[PDB]
Amino acid sequence: MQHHKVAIIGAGAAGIGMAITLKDFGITDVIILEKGTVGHSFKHWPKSTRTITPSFTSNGFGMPDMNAISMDTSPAFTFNEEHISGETYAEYLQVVANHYELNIFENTVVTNISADDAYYTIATTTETYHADYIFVATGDYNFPKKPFKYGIHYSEIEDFDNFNKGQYVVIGGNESGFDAAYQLAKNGSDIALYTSPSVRLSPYTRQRLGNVIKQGARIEMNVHYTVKDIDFNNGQYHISFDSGQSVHTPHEPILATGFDATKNPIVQQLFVTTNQDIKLTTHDESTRYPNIFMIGATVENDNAKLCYIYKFRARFAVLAHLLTQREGLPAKQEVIENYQKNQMYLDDYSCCEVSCTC
Amino acid sequence: MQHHKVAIIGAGAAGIGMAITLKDFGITDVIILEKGTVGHSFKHWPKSTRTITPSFTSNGFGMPDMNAISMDTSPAFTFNEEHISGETYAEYLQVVANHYELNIFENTVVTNISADDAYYTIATTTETYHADYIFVATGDYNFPKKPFKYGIHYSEIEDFDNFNKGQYVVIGGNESGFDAAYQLAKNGSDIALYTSPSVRLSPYTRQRLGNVIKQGARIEMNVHYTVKDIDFNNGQYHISFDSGQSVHTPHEPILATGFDATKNPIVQQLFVTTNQDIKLTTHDESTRYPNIFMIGATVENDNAKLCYIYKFRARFAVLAHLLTQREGLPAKQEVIENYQKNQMYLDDYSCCEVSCTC
Numbered sequence: 001m002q003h004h005k006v007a008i009i010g011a012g013a014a015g016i017g018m019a020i021t022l023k024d025f026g027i028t029d030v031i032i033l034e035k036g037t038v039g040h041s042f043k044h045w046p047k048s049t050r051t052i053t054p055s056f057t058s059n060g061f062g063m064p065d066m067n068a069i070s071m072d073t074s075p076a077f078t079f080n081e082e083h084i085s086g087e088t089y090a091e092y093l094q095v096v097a098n099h100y101e102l103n104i105f106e107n108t109v110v111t112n113i114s115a116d117d118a119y120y121t122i123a124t125t126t127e128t129y130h131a132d133y134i135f136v137a138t139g140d141y142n143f144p145k146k147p148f149k150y151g152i153h154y155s156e157i158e159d160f161d162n163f164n165k166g167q168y169v170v171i172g173g174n175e176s177g178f179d180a181a182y183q184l185a186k187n188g189s190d191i192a193l194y195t196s197p198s199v200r201l202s203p204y205t206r207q208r209l210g211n212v213i214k215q216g217a218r219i220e221m222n223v224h225y226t227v228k229d230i231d232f233n234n235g236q237y238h239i240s241f242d243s244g245q246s247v248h249t250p251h252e253p254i255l256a257t258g259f260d261a262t263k264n265p266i267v268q269q270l271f272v273t274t275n276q277d278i279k280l281t282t283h284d285e286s287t288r289y290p291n292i293f294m295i296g297a298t299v300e301n302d303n304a305k306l307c308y309i310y311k312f313r314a315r316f317a318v319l320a321h322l323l324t325q326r327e328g329l330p331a332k333q334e335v336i337e338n339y340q341k342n343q344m345y346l347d348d349y350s351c352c353e354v355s356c357t358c
Numbered sequence: 359m360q361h362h363k364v365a366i367i368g369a370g371a372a373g374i375g376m377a378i379t380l381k382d383f384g385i386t387d388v389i390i391l392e393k394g395t396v397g398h399s400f401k402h403w404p405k406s407t408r409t410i411t412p413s414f415t416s417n418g419f420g421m422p423d424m425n426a427i428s429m430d431t432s433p434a435f436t437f438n439e440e441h442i443s444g445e446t447y448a449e450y451l452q453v454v455a456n457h458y459e460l461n462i463f464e465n466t467v468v469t470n471i472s473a474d475d476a477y478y479t480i481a482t483t484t485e486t487y488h489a490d491y492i493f494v495a496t497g498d499y500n501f502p503k504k505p506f507k508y509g510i511h512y513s514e515i516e517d518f519d520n521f522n523k524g525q526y527v528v529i530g531g532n533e534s535g536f537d538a539a540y541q542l543a544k545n546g547s548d549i550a551l552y553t554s555p556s557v558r559l560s561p562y563t564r565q566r567l568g569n570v571i572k573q574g575a576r577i578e579m580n581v582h583y584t585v586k587d588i589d590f591n592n593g594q595y596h597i598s599f600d601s602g603q604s605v606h607t608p609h610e611p612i613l614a615t616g617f618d619a620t621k622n623p624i625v626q627q628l629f630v631t632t633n634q635d636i637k638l639t640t641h642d643e644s645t646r647y648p649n650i651f652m653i654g655a656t657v658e659n660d661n662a663k664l665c666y667i668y669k670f671r672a673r674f675a676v677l678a679h680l681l682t683q684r685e686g687l688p689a690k691q692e693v694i695e696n697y698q699k700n701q702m703y704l705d706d707y708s709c710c711e712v713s714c715t716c
């Protein structure tokens with residue numbers, strides 16, 4: 001019934017962060033609608049997965065803990081950990097949501113959003129809600145890319161310890177693929193990795209991988225290979241490539257293949273989704289519906305992929321301000337200045353240009 | 359002979375960083391005078407010591423790698439490491455010094471600085487130099503606190519592996535003391551730690567310490583003890599405390615006791631050094647001599663201890679600007695704005711107030 005100012009779809013990193021930022025800009029009539037519980041995606045990381053980005057409570061001197069979604073919070077503070085488990089990060093989001101008294105509705109699958117006269121109407125599996133501004137914060141963890149007949153996606157592994165010691169193949173040479181190799185190899189398995197790469201790799205994964213290898217771990221990498229299909233016959237898996245002889249392997253291959261936000265129905269209803277790409281204005285706004293915005297790790301602008309918390313969280317306050325100006329309210333320059341001083345006001349993508357001189 | 363604009367005493371983290379920042383503000387007639395080689399202190403860390411602060415190349419999106427001493431550099435970039443060895447950090451400072459073409463004079467022990475009419479005169483063991491502005495960047499690693507008859511200071515250990523497996527005592531329950539315990543315990547020794555503390559500890563050291571302990575390591579901590587003296591008699595070391603029965607131990611105790619910058623002759627000549635405290639103006643300037651400043655980890659203001667790279671490096675550009683204004687040159691607002699945007703313009707200590715809400 002209520003004519004809410006804001007509805008945020010999804011109570012993940014981006015939705016919780018955005019709700020806190022909106023509060024700082026004086027916007028409190030905000031509901032968050034979540035299909036599972038706060039931090040759903042993080043709770044479904046494999047058990048051993050840790051953030052590659054390290055948490056340190058540098059919050060006082062100009063940059064908040066890189067994994068924090070608000071200026072005054074820090075997983076390193078709450079948990080005394082540097083590399084955070086998904087389970088711990090879910091709890092971080094719960095601790096922060098409880099503290100800032102966010103109005104969140106769990107176990108509510110948003111099914112349809114449409115325009116009415118005075119607001120947007122939000123159909124869910126629970127009840128209907130209404131709001132002026134919508135922040136689509138739905139991510140993509142539930143839409144992993146599974147292009148072949150077989151293969152276990154990284155996102156569907158509960159615990160790499162459940163795999164018996166043996167011979168495994170990993171497809172995708174990225175952060176998750178090398179993590180998969182490292183998790184399996186640390187338990188004594190032999191891994192073959194096929195990739196479309198160690199040069200793009202974060203220090204955390206690079207050092208962990210290098211240490212098990214330096215200690216004799218058997219991890220091999222084949223570097224100019226693209227998988228055509230995976231089939232199962234004659235008691236084993238057969239990986240066929242575009243250019244190259246097929247390969248056979250005893251256990252199901254692990255796919256570190258990525259995800260696709262355009263597969264989300266809500267994204268399809270609210271944005272132009274031309275080609276696995278979500279079209280947004282320079283203010284992260286839908287080009288179809290006004291006052292509908294996209295937030296989180298799925299925001300790409302080909303001036304920045306925004307896939308890290310420390311990147312996508314810098315947009316929150318830029319949108320909160322825009323919202324206050326469209327509402328005819330004065331600019332909250334005390335607040336805008338805190339965000340700017342703490343690296344959380346990315347208003348110009350021209351200066352996201354990341355490159356070191358040596 | 360030359361009437362230099364600037365002389366920086368010390369080519370450590372702070373001296374190299376300050377020279378690069380001065381260059382960005384258009385001040386290039388800068389000499390750096392170093393008693394050893396670039397990064398001398400780091401080269402004399404114990405071999406196993408790593409920065410507790412993690413390096414990640416976040417440089418593009420508003421905060422440079424926390425261990426970097428300039429905006430456009432990153433040990434994570436150059437070395438693909440997160441927790442940096444002292445040896446690697448020395449090389450980082452050398453790579454950056456070579457790239458920015460700093461004018462550095464190694465193996466030059468500065469012995470005396472005094473006022474002349476048109477500039478300051480700098481007596482060294484090599485030759486005499488002259489400069490308008492002096493940045494005292496001498497640190498304190500060579501003045502460890504050794505208050506007892508015996509004890510091996512943490513800073514004088516080359517390699518914790520050289521200690522035979524056995525029974526050790528560590529005095530001081532801080533980052534270095536817990537590192538000492540962890541290094542010895544990981545090689546199977548039993549450690550007794552005496553402290554004036556795990557709550558102040560960084561995530562990196564907390565997790566490493568907790569892991570060896572969880573794996574059965576024998577590390578014990580006695581928490582309300584102050585060492586009076588250490589003596590050696592009857593084949594062993596005797597630790598006597600203010601309040602408490604003495605203790606006896608077979609090997610020389612390891613002191614994680616800290617350092618004292620006021621023991622440096624150059625600091626004594628240029629600052630009021632009342633009580634292990636160095637008196638500075640709100641612009642890090644000497645209260646005795648104008649245009650003489652203190653930079654680095656030794657700058658404390660009881661509004662901030664500035665003992666971390668990410669803290670003390672934020673003062674560089676504030677001083678560089680002050681210098682340009684005293685020179686009657688226009689404010690370089692392009693530069694001032696880069697520094698401000700990258701968390702490296704700490705002009706007001708009132709906002710160094712570090713405290714998380716949860």
Ligand SMILES: Cc1cc2nc3c(=O)[nH]c(=O)nc-3n(C[C@H](O)[C@H](O)[C@H](O)COP(=O)(O)OP(=O)(O)OC[C@H]3O[C@@H](n4cnc5c(N)ncnc54)[C@H](O)[C@@H]3O)c2cc1C
Binds near residue numbers: 009014034040045139
């Ligand atoms: C394995 C892995 C490791 C990562 N490691 C790092 C790291 O080291 N550092 C870093 O900065 N980032 C990391 N990330 C990247 C990024 O931070 C995460 O993807 C993060 O989850 C992005 O946050 P989000 O809010 O955009 O999405 P999510 O956290 O996925 O939140 C989306 C939420 O919306 C909900 N939802 C979806 N559809 C609906 C609907 N129809 N109705 C209601 N609710 C819905 C979901 O249940 C979910 O909780 C990692 C990601 C992955 C997958």
Ligand SMILES: Cc1cc2nc3c(=O)[nH]c(=O)nc-3n(C[C@H](O)[C@H](O)[C@H](O)COP(=O)(O)OP(=O)(O)OC[C@H]3O[C@@H](n4cnc5c(N)ncnc54)[C@H](O)[C@@H]3O)c2cc1C
Binds near residue numbers: 372469499
């Ligand atoms: C063991 C240890 C671990 C640390 N870990 C971290 C970390 O995790 N993260 C972090 O941010 N900081 C860390 N630090 C804190 C701080 O960053 C270091 O102390 C750092 O060395 C400070 O840099 P500096 O330039 O002020 O001093 P220094 O690096 O010590 O530089 C001073 C230089 O001046 C030279 N010098 C001294 N006297 C003279 C003279 N008379 N004439 C010419 N040259 C002279 C010296 O040779 C030396 O090279 C750590 C420090 C120690 C001791």
